[PDB]
Design a protein around this nucleic acid. Structure first.
Ligand SMILES: Nc1ncnc2c1ncn2[C@@H]1O[C@@H]2COP(=O)(O)O[C@H]2[C@H]1O
Length: 201
DNA sequence: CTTGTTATCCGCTCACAATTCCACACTAATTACGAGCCGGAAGCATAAAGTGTAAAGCCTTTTTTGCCTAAAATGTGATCTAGATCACATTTATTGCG
């Protein structure tokens, strides 16, 4: 449909792992779209602690905020998590496609609504719910993600002990303590990054 | 031889000054006077209907002030679990290469 009409003017260019698709400081002159794989977006402070806002899997767009208002810069950093195939379309030639077919814009701004609902309703849980409650909800949220692999016992995901604290809002030390505590009670499992939870499904 | 028109000459009335900015300093003479006349206005107070101004005399509406106190917001500090904090040491999992 409209999606196929979008790939007719794209520029196929594969990006290796640990690459740089979006550099905070450069000029936004290329729209990116995810075909296969996944990518992560995060920011940094003055020390070195990271902070992931939201994850973007396949079928999502990369850097679309610098399209509505011409003359902007890259907000956050976008590092390629895994081998992903991303297209390339200049914003200049994109604006001409909207004036002749606004329907194409109805697709991009359609995914910008869900990314706001999962963030606004998350703040409330990061002010009342304790560590046990915040992490508990996170386990189910990551299980609903398409990048999650089906497990005979439950769900198998791969996330570090830092990214967890960046979602529930806490220190990295606290995460490791509770994580190992649930292991003794036979509730979940962890072997570095891969965390297999139980009770799901 | 005398006459005409024509050409040359003169004095005359006639038409006719064009390289381009600024500064400093300086400058005007003369018709006889006196007495009598009517003129405008000096601005005087007057006075009136008409007009537009300038006191402040109680009403009504707004706006700051001081008021009361019923109901909601606010420290007391010593103990106690769930939270946070640094640096930069060492250990860990990411996508490939060969
Ligand atoms: N919380 C978020 N949810 C979804 N996308 C994001 C989020 N934060 C940053 N991004 C994307 O990261 C991109 C960084 O570059 P852009 O400003 O071009 O566009 C930004 C967004 O598209």
């Amino acid at each position: 449909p409209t999606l196929e009409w979008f790939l007719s003017h794209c520029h196929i260019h594969k990006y290796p792992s640990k690459s740089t698709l979006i550099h905070q400081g450069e000029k936004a002159e290329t729209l990116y779209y995810i075909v296969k794989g996944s990518v992560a977006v995060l920011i940094k402070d003055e020390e070195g602690k990271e902070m992931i806002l939201s994850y973007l899997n396949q079928g999502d767009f990369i850097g679309e905020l610098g399209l509505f208002e011409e003359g902007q810069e890259r907000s956050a950093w976008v590092r390629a998590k895994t081998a992903c195939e991303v297209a390339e379309i200049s914003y200049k030639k994109f604006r001409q496609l909207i004036q002749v077919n606004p329907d194409i814009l109805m697709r991009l701004s359609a995914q910008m609504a869900r990314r706001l609902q999962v963030t606004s309703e998350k703040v409330g849980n990061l002010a009342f719910l304790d560590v046990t409650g915040r992490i508990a909800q996170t386990l189910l949220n990551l299980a609903k993600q398409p990048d999650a692999m089906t497990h005979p016992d439950g769900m198998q995901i791969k996330i570090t002990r830092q990214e967890i604290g960046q979602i529930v809002g806490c220190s990295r030390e606290t995460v490791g303590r509770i994580l190992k505590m649930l292991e003794d009670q036979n509730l979940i499992s962890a072997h570095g990054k891969t965390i297999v939870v139980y009770g799901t499904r």
